[PDB]
Amino acid sequence: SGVDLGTENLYFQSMPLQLLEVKARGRFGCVWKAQLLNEYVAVKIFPIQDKQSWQNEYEVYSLPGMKHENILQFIGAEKRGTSVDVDLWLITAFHEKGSLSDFLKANVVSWNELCHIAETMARGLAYLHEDIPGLKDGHKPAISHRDIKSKNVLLKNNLTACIADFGLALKFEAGKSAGTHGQVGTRRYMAPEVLEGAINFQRDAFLRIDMYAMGLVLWELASRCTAADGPVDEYMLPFEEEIGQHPSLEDMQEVVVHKKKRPVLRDYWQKHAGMAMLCETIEECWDHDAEARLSAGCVGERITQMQRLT
Ligand SMILES: Cn1c2c(c3ccc(Cl)c(Cl)c31)CCNC2=O
Secondary structure: OOOOOOOOOEEEOOEEEEEEEEEEEOOOOEEEEEEEOOEEEEEEEEOHHHHHHHHHHHHHHOOOOOOOOOEOOEEEEEEEEOOOOEEEEEEEEOOOOOEHHHHHHHOOEOHHHHHHHHHHHHHHHHHHHOOEEEEOOEEEOEEEOOOOOHHHEEEOOOOOEEEOOOOOOEEEOOOOOOOOOOOOOOHHHOOHHHHOOOOOOOHHHHHHHHHHHHHHHHHHHHHOEOHHHOOOOOOOOOOHHHHOOOOOHHHHHHHHHHOOOOOOOOHHHHHOHHHHHHHHHHHHHOOOOHHHOOOHHHHHHHHHHHHOOO
């Protein structure tokens, strides 16, 4: 996998590397499609002012157990150049289909494709969320992502989803509370309690915040799904219909908190038994009541259930 034009190359671990083109813009850096030896890889390049996000992501990837089919594969990380011109790189697998966001813009999904992407995404988030003692490399902590959105879910060639971008991720050692405000993520996906600015610095509070955002990603999937053979409109961001592409904090507060509104679950989706069950699941994920939200693992099983629905 890779063309061979014969020009100047760089090295990574003594292996030829070349940058191809910018593929995406992360929150903290630029994602390049690149060629390393004979494979395509993604080189995420962080400016020096985002050194802490580079460090955070490297640290997260260095935690016990952080290798999984539904977590974007880490290849390496390196502080390069000089202390006056610092190059901060993090290299991962590259996936040609890119983000679920880009995919859904250009493509629709059948019922069974939606189920595959949904289940795999859910399993990746559940694994990220899971506290896992007894690994050969140590004790994996529960990890909150803190910016779950369709831009941060990548699709492999057969539409298997994986979770990407751990620049904001925060691990939790235990279940005890520690006192916070937490508007670090993407505004349109922020849960009501986040938009109000008043949250519990506790593991479950942070996991429930991710689960609200994942409910919105599942709505995105439903919005572009051909199940039951109805009309499918052009891809829209969650809340774009209600408050546009660049909402203020105030707009989000009005729609999400005061009006308790969510993206529309279309009436004709209730006629397909699988979609109806998806709709129920999404509703539990985005509940105003954080304690009412489903866990990532629960969602995994709902999807398996609905995929096997009869
Ligand atoms: C590794 N990666 C990231 C993004 C990507 C988009 C497309 C592809 Cl192919 C890859 Cl590998 C991406 C978006 C923001 N953050 C990432 O960490």
